[model samples]
Target: KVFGRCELAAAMKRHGLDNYRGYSLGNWVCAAKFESNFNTQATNRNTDGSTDYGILQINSRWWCNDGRTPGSRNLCNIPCSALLSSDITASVNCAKKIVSDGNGMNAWVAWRNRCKGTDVQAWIRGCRL
Candidate 1:
């Protein structure tokens, strides 16, 4: 499912991403925007032979078990296919785990290059939260 900007923002907030790990809601929303355009089924193959899955684009190399990413840590303890569902529970949980990996939102290059240090509040205004 492809979510609208405000819609995605509200959804992430529902999952408690707002201000999580010291990163604001806007940060997550912005990262999702650039990472997968809020498409829940989005997936990307990395040059390192890993894959990024779902709306937040959680990577398989260290996050999900795709049965193919060599040496995959499967830190999220979930199948990569789980992240592709329209129900974002698995994806959101895994995303939280990613941020909690001592790097916060820096786990995502899109967050670092696009959302970090930017005035993200402006983009999530429509969320009304």
Candidate 2:
């Protein structure tokens, strides 16, 4: 797991993710915190039997392609493994697309359950972005 909060913030800014689709940088960072604890290789199985991929915990049910999971929507047109890396570009882009699809950060349960409606500034407080 990565521990460089400032580095993550800088990368997000460079990728234009700081305010992508009206979502705050705090929201993105906080979602990453809860969903993966800033770990790029994070993955988890969902209750519905699908898997979540990477830092954003994107669902295989409708997001990325995972051959083992049939009927994946692949909305991001990316392989699930693509999100499970330190690069984070594909993950960030796919997450932005998901949010732009009208779901906001609601696409991530972590955001809805943990980051939403909370004082999120703390997520980026010491990060020099």
Candidate 3:
């Protein structure tokens, strides 16, 4: 919740996300922009009763556990609430694991739908980070 694009870019670089999963920092940034507008507290309830968590909008059905949600896969072994904070470390770590699972940034439908095959670097343009 405390990050703008430049701050988020700097944080991502500090965390080595600028080049993780062979995807550029911009890709991640773009995904976060569309998923949650860089807000750490973002959440969305899906029609299927699952909820997406944090900046990455990671789903309760597959990645993290929301206490009230049932049938969570919790692949990242993290609490969904933990993702909803100004600190992005946990969300980034889980996202890296998600990329490692072979989806790349394509794991985020936002990236696929909005950032894919486009000028992704625009997400970080003028950020100077």
Candidate 4:
């Protein structure tokens, strides 16, 4: 965890997600904990590896059309990894779109709802921010 100011700053700048800076830590941590326990290299072939990816557990394959690539700007894809791989901001932005689209943060909300107890602690404990 140990989410330093620099990474948080970088994350904010990377995704233009300044509004979620302070309040987002807990949920982000919760999501990560629920998804992959903060494993950037995390993957699951059984689920088509389309569930989530990276430290934030972003769904690359489902979040962006260009996640498999690195130069796509299609902000609306599934699997999350599509945008996560290309850019962390893209991942966050994708989630924003999903939320706006009525997904309610989708996996993120699930992460939050899943980790209703100890997972939250693990998130704060690991997250150094």
Candidate 5:
């Protein structure tokens, strides 16, 4: 039941994306939905048919496991994953960092204006951090 705007903010804050407390929720959802059908639990295996996991389509092998110890969290910490999975606040904020950095409201508003009803990558182009 998470809306897009708030999630964007969370993702931004979590990832330290720019400095904007808020971001274009619609755009963030648009991208995530289009990429992964808004499925927080979606996954795609590699050529060898391994396992990938999480929203934002982060490859566990690369994003989660690239640099970590065996016992450390790897994109699937129950609480952390629950916190960061597909939740709009978490995703959007993460996108803010992955996409915008920390530009602030201008970056978010601009994304909204450019991507309210468009493709995701174009939205990425619109986000000016």
Candidate 6:
């Protein structure tokens, strides 16, 4: 599923993206905007031979088990395929696990390059919140 900006904002908020782990809701929205444009089935193969999945693009390297990544930790204990669904619960929960592991939002390079140290409000500008 591909989500519009505000649509993604509201959906992510319902999933508890608001101020999660010292990160703002807007930050999450912003990251998702750049990460996969809120497309649930988005996938990217990394140079390291790992794949990123879902809107959040959770990596197979350390977060989920894709059965193809060379050194996967499967820390989220979920199949990487689960992240491709439109439900988004798996992606949100896995993201929480990623941060709860102390990796922070910085785990996403998109967050670092585009969402960090900037006014993130634009990501949720028209959202109801």
1-129 per-residue lDDT for model 1 (tens digits): 998999888888899988888888888889999999999999999999999999999999999999889879999999999999988889999998889989788889998998889999876985665
Q: Order the candidates by lDDT, highest first — what do you get?
A: 1, 6, 3, 2, 4, 5
* Candidate 4 lDDT for residue 29: 49
**Per-prediction TM-score to the true structure, in the order listed:** 0.96, 0.93, 0.94, 0.50, 0.39, 0.95
**What are the Cα lDDT values of the candidates?**
0.90, 0.85, 0.88, 0.48, 0.43, 0.89
Measured by lDDT, the strongest candidate is 1
Runs with alpha carbons beyond 4 Å of true place in candidate 4: 1-23, 46-51, 56-62, 66-87, 109-113, 116-129
**Residues 1-129 of candidate 3: C-alpha lDDT, one tens digit per residue:** 857998898888888898787889999888889999989999999988989999889989888999767787899999999999789999989988888887677789888999999898988899877
- Candidate 3 stretches with Cα past 4 Å from truth are none
Give lDDT tens digits, candidate 6, residues 26-77.
Answer: 9998898889988999999999999999999999999999999998999999
C-alpha-based local distance difference test score of model 5:
0.43
Better of 3 and 4 by TM-score: 3
For candidate 5, lDDT tens digit of each residue in 10-120? 454355543334444445544454445546666565554333444554434322442322333443322324423545454443444444434442333333454545654
lDDT (C-alpha) at residue 73 in model 3: 85
Clashes of each: 0, 0, 0, 25, 15, 0
Q: What's model 1's lDDT at 67?
A: 89
- In candidate 5, residue 44 scores what lDDT? 63
Candidate 1 lands at a TM-score of 0.96
Model 5 residue runs over 4 Å out of place are: 1-23, 48-51, 66-97, 100-129
| Runs with alpha carbons beyond 4 Å of true place in candidate 1 | none
